Structures are given as C-alpha cells and as structure tokens.
Amino acid sequence: ADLLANIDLKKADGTVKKGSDALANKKVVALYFSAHWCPPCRQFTPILKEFYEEVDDDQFEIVFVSLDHSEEDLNNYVKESHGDWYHVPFGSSEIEKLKNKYEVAGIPMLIVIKSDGNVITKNGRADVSGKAPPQTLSSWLAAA
C-alpha cells in the first residue's frame, strides 16, 4: 500500500502526475506542511532545499502540503523558495485529509513517512535544521 498512490501531485514546471508514478521507488517521503504567511516557514524552506539538493537521493522525495490561502500564494512560494519536489494542488481535498491524518495545526511541520504512510518521525524539522522552538519550549514547560 502507498499513501498517495491515487493523488494528483504537481511540480513547479506545471506537470501533474499520480502519486503511484511520482513516488515510485521512493522509500522515504517527507510531507512538508508550510505556508508563505508563516515567517518560521519561510526561514526553514531554504534549509530544506539545501538538505534535499545535498543528499541528491532517488529513494527520497518531498511533498509540499500547502496551508497558503490562495493558489497564487502557493505558486509564488514554490517558485521563490522550494526545491524541485512535488506539491498537492491548491484546493485539493487531499490537503485537509493529510492535515487530519497527521494531526497538523502549527507549521512548519516536516513529517517523515514510509511510502505506506506510517510515521518515521514527526520531528523532521529538528532533524533537518537542528531547531524546533515549539517542541523545545514544550519540553521545558513539562519539566517546570
């Protein structure tokens, strides 16, 4: 089973294919939940692009799941800052489905999954950047 087998996924060049074709041979997929309106998001995205380009690994893929408020904002964000990975089209019902499935509210969030959808780690952001302020403050509070 692979999570996104039947979902339309798009690249910056505008081409669309089904997840069964886009993510074939991917062993690890990172779901990146983000939006242009979010200042921590905009700071993390270049660090994510650097990671993606350094590893240069055809077993790995990123899928952007946008919390942007319009298709214009989604597309400009991708063009301005993202590496050459896939994203879910604006307006797709899959955006909400994925947010619900992974319990995403606050962003940025980088959820690293097996191709079947099981979570490897919800802490993709910290693994990539070395930092994740909400989770850090939460463990401080939980010790206080």
UniProtKB/TrEMBL annotation:
InterPro entries registered for this protein in UniProt: RdCVF2, Thioredoxin-like_fold, Thioredoxin-like_sf, Thioredoxin_domain
CDD domains the record matches: TryX_like_family (cd02964)
Q: Which gene is annotated as encoding this protein in its UniProt record?
A: TRX
Cysteine disulfide partners in this protein: C38-C41
Ranges for the region named Disordered are 125-144
Domain of life from the UniProt record: Eukaryota
Q: Which GO terms describe its biological process?
A: photoreceptor cell maintenance; sensory perception
Name of the molecule in the record: Thioredoxin
In which residue ranges is the amino acid composition biased (Polar residues)?
Answer: 135-144
Q: Which SUPFAM superfamilies match?
A: Thioredoxin-like (SSF52833)
Q: Which residues form the Thioredoxin domain?
A: 1-144
Species of provenance = Wuchereria bancrofti
